[PDB]
Amino acid sequence: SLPIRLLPEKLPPPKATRGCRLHNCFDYSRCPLTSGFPVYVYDSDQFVFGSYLDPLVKQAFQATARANVYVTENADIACLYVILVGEMQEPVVLRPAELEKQLYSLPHWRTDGHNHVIINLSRKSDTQNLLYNVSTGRAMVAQSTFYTVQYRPGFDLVVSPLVHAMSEPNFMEIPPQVPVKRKYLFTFQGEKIEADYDDRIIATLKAVQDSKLDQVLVEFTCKNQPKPSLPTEWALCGEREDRLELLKLSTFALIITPGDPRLVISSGCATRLFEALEVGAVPVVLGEQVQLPYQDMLQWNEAALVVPKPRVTEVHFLLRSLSDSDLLAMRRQGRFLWETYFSTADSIFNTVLAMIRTRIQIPAAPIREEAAAEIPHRSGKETEPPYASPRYLRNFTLTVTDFYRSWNCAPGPFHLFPHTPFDPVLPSEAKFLGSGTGFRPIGGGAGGSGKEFQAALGGNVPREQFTVVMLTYEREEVLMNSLERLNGLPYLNKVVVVWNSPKLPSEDLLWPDIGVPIMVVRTEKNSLNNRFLPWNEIETEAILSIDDDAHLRHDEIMFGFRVWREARDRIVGFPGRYHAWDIPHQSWLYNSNYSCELSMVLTGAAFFHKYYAYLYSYVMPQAIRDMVDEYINCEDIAMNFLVSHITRKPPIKVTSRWTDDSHFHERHKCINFFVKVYGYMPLLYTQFRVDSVLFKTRLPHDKTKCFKFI
Amino acid sequence: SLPIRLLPEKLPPPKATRGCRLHNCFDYSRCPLTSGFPVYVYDSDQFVFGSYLDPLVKQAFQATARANVYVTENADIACLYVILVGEMQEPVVLRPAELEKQLYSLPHWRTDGHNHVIINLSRKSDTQNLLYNVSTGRAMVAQSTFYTVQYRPGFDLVVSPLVHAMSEPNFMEIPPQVPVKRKYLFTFQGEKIADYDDRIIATLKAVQDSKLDQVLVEFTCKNQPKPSLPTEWALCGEREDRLELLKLSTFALIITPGDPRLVISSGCATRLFEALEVGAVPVVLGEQVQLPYQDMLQWNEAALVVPKPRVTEVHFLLRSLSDSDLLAMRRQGRFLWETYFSTADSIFNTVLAMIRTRIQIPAAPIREEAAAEIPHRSGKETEPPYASPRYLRNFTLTVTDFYRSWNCAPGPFHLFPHTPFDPVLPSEAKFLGSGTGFRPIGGGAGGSGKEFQAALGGNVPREQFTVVMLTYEREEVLMNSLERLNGLPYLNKVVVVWNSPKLPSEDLLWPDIGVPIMVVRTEKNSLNNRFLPWNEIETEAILSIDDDAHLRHDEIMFGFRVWREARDRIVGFPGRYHAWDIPHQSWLYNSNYSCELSMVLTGAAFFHKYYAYLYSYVMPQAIRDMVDEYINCEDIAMNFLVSHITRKPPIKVTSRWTFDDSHFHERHKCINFFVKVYGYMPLLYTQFRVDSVLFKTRLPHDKTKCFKFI
């Protein structure tokens, strides 16, 4: 039933509007937990704001809003109303009290603005503060500049400046994250045009430069004129492009907050933060009174040092005491934050929406999937029928309860997945004490040797099946034979066959009958990235990805499946490979030699969770899929990069199995290009493989091996 | 150099005291980052407060403070000054403005109380607000009742009520965590003597009356309610009555006060305390509330916090949580309750650790076990022993890693020399400027068994291990197992824990194995002594080995290499498992040959020294008591500890299994007693073991196996 309705205003004083929070100014009755999060976006061209808006801000905002999955044209169902009011073109023509009157005139303002968010995105000006003397009713405000008297914490949003309006950033112009230490340990550029700690900061930082214990470069005036700025701020110097050239050479970048403690955040402070994260300079913010973009959801200490101004006398020691792996961890998290929430208009709009939505406990929209066109066909000639894995069992838990990881760990909070490899496991007594649906413990829980083992999946999670995904192209005869080797496979739910050839399968084809369905899917084009699309016909969590020419025995498939049920976030597989350091060229090589150390497992024969299919196809960078289609190669390398980036673990190699020239050199090019897209090498090494527990173990007579051969 | 000094008051208005924050009212010059965190505690028996204090509060606080590592009697070096002012015996004699004057009279108040924390711990009263009319200068306040006017976020502290004053809580009266669902879905008991309260009552009654679930909601008390603040839902009965119903509740409702200015109250904090205490997952109606320690704890992992207007959806929401998610919230509530709420020591440690953390100073180093070496005389790769570097992450573990520090076990109170959770460098960093200590196989080209034996490789810099070997009255076998160690690569030293009460014989010739052999004396004979953090252990890696174990050198080297890639786990040879006793609904120790394992016995395993500190000094005493009673089960206890911390099974290396009846049955009793201590069974199952990557693989002639036999 519907949430209780907020009672509206029947004008309100500034004490009242400063007192607004969700618990007294937001109408939850428009927003049932199960009605989605429909968002109404006002067309700013119908209101006075449109013609005063900065043109690039307006254009990038309208294009993002048009493409957004939550936006609805039906104001009657909307939970949230968005009005874009800035930033405005300078000099600001419109007077404050006029800006107020047009806000109170918006079509769905009702009496007070409840459930509206006012968006005001900075791009060229660091001195605008359009809403300062404006009464906003019960609306929330999203902008980059706030004084204390205007910031309502937990209700307003501090957001990032819009830099890449009507453009795309170039991930190739970002310096690599390694080497850790750059030319300068830290730098700062600014100018101030006049408790005052500012004078001890300057004296301490100058003394560090003059000591010549580290290479630093600190400058408290600009070569030319400084950009205008708010009072007591350290104004920016030069153009975006000048400042970046220096920050690209800095291990750390100083950000000295404004001298007036009432300036909670400013356009200028957030710009410096934006620019430092953009190129991997770890921010060092002096002044704990600041509110950084998105601070209610992001743990900023993981990407930035935030330090009271009185500890300036200890900054030099502190920056010298951080290890290389801690410092590189901070750089790697600043890249995640900057890409996900700062870098484009889409990033920013998705962050505003997702912040408001999470604060009111509504799950994200469900990530799309690949609607498949089945190619119907005709077939030729344990004890139960296929069962799908349950879906969407954690809507509230992944949104609210897992708040920290949702927002501070990749891939971020914007999508709802049908399932994930990070679901917590039950303690091992719960299956015997009331939570046993689907559990199949070996030997009823007493365990045993090979007899009992083969009679039950066991493990720490309920039983399930897996889906085979088999890519094929112009190989109609070998396909039918390998499809037949799957007859009798335990726990097989269905086979999905991805038909890449442009010529459909001949009408007169007698596919085998293997006891489970065989769906043949049509592909709008011929790509190796098509094996990782999240086909709606895949109804399990587990995928066994296999080439139409791969020869796995049934016992291998079953041992791999049980390993993966205990390593659900990993690529678990058979073909082990590794990346080799090209010593003279200081670069990477693909290496498939026999080896005692591995770092990739090829997806021509491996288990992985369908979660990574959604990521590979819709969240990972386009430049990587672009390159897979160019070389018709390397999709297995890209998927080991993705999974090892998300998990920071190597893959897992199962059993002792191990199985032209311009193709092989395409794989050195791929490894080195993928490293430029990510900023670093995510692959890691393992010095073991997994076998069954009693592999090659001598046993008494009343005991049996788990498998005959593996 | 010292931090910049805060400029003192030369009386201040209420607008000034309400704006105090660390950035304008704390004097960082008393608190350099590297001078520790010395705390001065005023003796409240010298000031007016002492005779009015509740005597049990006063006695429990003074006891904790006398035993606290940070506390000093030298007020000249102190960074923080602590004064206990409450709670006071009822009816409260002392008038407000008097309490103000004794505060300004404190010996080291100086002019304004800077760097003072005022502590006011509740126990018996739910109506006290001692400091409401009291000017506090620049001092922080730590207490359980705050109105909005008085609460300074980020500066004041919301703490737990002091329930077990001068007592210890009994962990065996805590109902077990499983089964997940208990008799009632939720319960509530209280009486009350925008206004959403009427719809809440109506809604919750309708849920009771629907008989879709078993619930018990009562909006008056059997007898007279405890006194409370206005608009509060007052507590009913005595602590022992409320807990008997909560013990049977899956969820406990907490309905926050009707006046939104009452940010938190003793009565709300008591309901939170009692719910967590017995495993009822709190459901808090009202987001305006500030829960204890909320600046540091992510409460959404332990409680559902829900706007009052969404009461109409609470029933739907409680039914939609999966079993594994509800259990994870119960297990997190227990961690929070025990670490920060349960005793006077918990509370006082938490107040100190909050303020210390907020000013970026690391925790006191955990103690180690000063070894008394027993000098002895000895009989008759190319480098000399190197110890592991220590304390490389003081700032990062305190500030950067804030979330895990506070919200994951073991909590934030100790600084360890090193941990198994240090982040790993991306694999190109060893070649591009961070290569100190790294020994990659084939210099980064890799290879086969030849190169693999020449270099540890891996993802971490090289290091060594220490053998710890327990012995008791087996003088002849000891010398012989010590001699098996001669020649072992990467061995730093051998620490021999001499558990026999009779010293070694003076005429003893110990072997000379090429490294030192330290023989340490034990004050008593305990199996716990193999897990004490002897200050002679100079490495991170420990190879725990009984005096009668035969490990070959290759086994040790492959085990060491697995651990270097699995640093948080027990990595070892002897696999065992816990088996469910189907008729008695309880656990059994089982050592049969098995295809599924859950334990690795520490009689032959690698683990990180970090877990010796935890086993000895943090893990509950009752577990070490039982190990001493039966002289048994130290290996089951350490498997419980490590699987509790990591929620992962151990790792079993190679095919080795090979190595009276009242001993075997003591092990059933340990497993089932430990489950009572923890509240749940932490062990988990694995259906694989590890072997080298080319174990039993058919290799060309230009390639060599990693090891000859494993």
Ligand SMILES: *[C@@H]1O[C@H](CO)[C@@H](O[C@@H]2O[C@H](CO)[C@@H](O[C@@H]3O[C@H](CO[C@H]4O[C@H](CO)[C@@H](O)[C@H](O)[C@@H]4O)[C@@H](O)[C@H](O[C@H]4O[C@H](CO)[C@@H](O)[C@H](O)[C@@H]4O)[C@@H]3O)[C@H](O)[C@H]2NC(C)=O)[C@H](O)[C@H]1NC(C)=O
């Ligand atoms: C099994 O393991 C072996 C041993 O590690 C691998 O052998 C290496 O293969 C790589 C790539 O094929 C070789 O590296 C390349 O060398 C080129 C010049 O090599 C000559 O010189 C060596 C000895 O000095 C001869 O043995 C060889 O026959 C050649 O005559 C460079 O031009 C290459 O650089 C290219 O790519 C990089 C990107 O990283 C660019 O910077 C360059 O401009 C260029 O475009 C590269 O360095 C290496 O020499 C081989 N080692 C040995 C000892 O022979 C096998 O490839 C591996 N097998 C499999 C299947 O993976």
Ligand SMILES: *[C@@H]1O[C@H](CO)[C@@H](O[C@@H]2O[C@H](CO)[C@@H](O[C@@H]3O[C@H](CO[C@H]4O[C@H](CO)[C@@H](O)[C@H](O)[C@@H]4O)[C@@H](O)[C@H](O[C@H]4O[C@H](CO)[C@@H](O)[C@H](O)[C@@H]4O)[C@@H]3O)[C@H](O)[C@H]2NC(C)=O)[C@H](O)[C@H]1NC(C)=O
């Ligand atoms: C290798 O694997 C086997 C098979 O799982 C293990 O055998 C089991 O051993 C356990 C414990 O030793 C046995 O469990 C106990 O059973 C007692 C009654 O058993 C009788 O009945 C069976 C058949 O019904 C006979 O075969 C047996 O010889 C006996 O005559 C119970 O009384 C025990 O309960 C005790 O502990 C619990 C705590 O959980 C308390 O609550 C009780 O009060 C009581 O004090 C217990 O349930 C089990 O019967 C054995 N199974 C079989 C088939 O023999 C081996 O132990 C294992 N070996 C190794 C080395 O691990």
Ligand SMILES: *[C@@H]1O[C@H](CO)[C@@H](O[C@@H]2O[C@H](CO)[C@@H](O)[C@H](O)[C@H]2NC(C)=O)[C@H](O)[C@H]1NC(C)=O
């Ligand atoms: C969890 O979220 C999913 C996705 O938003 C919900 O699934 C939708 O449920 C409605 C109502 O049954 C259906 O009409 C849609 O077809 C479903 N969408 C999809 C993509 O499956 C699900 O109901 C939510 N679960 C809970 C417990 O709230």
Ligand SMILES: *[C@@H]1O[C@H](CO)[C@@H](O[C@@H]2O[C@H](CO)[C@@H](O)[C@H](O)[C@H]2NC(C)=O)[C@H](O)[C@H]1NC(C)=O
């Ligand atoms: C990290 O913390 C440790 C533990 O407090 C510091 O170690 C102490 O340092 C002082 C001065 O160097 C010595 O006199 C003590 O003996 C040390 N204690 C121990 C237990 O070794 C260490 O200096 C800190 N490191 C940094 C970089 O701040």
Ligand SMILES: O=c1ccn([C@@H]2O[C@H](COP(=O)(O)OP(=O)(O)O)[C@@H](O)[C@H]2O)c(=O)[nH]1
């Ligand atoms: O243009 C192409 C070429 C290949 N494939 C598929 O890609 C996989 C890998 O190709 P192949 O087995 O020929 O490589 P190999 O593993 O033999 O080196 C197989 O499933 C092919 O059917 C494809 O979909 N399109």
Ligand SMILES: O=c1ccn([C@@H]2O[C@H](COP(=O)(O)OP(=O)(O)O)[C@@H](O)[C@H]2O)c(=O)[nH]1
């Ligand atoms: O009172 C005792 C009994 C045993 N042990 C040690 O405990 C370990 C394991 O004991 P034992 O080998 O006797 O058990 P087993 O492994 O042979 O069953 C050995 O290192 C013993 O020296 C000990 O320190 N004190």
Ligand SMILES: [Mn+2]
């Ligand atoms: Mn193939």
Ligand SMILES: [Mn+2]
């Ligand atoms: Mn032994």
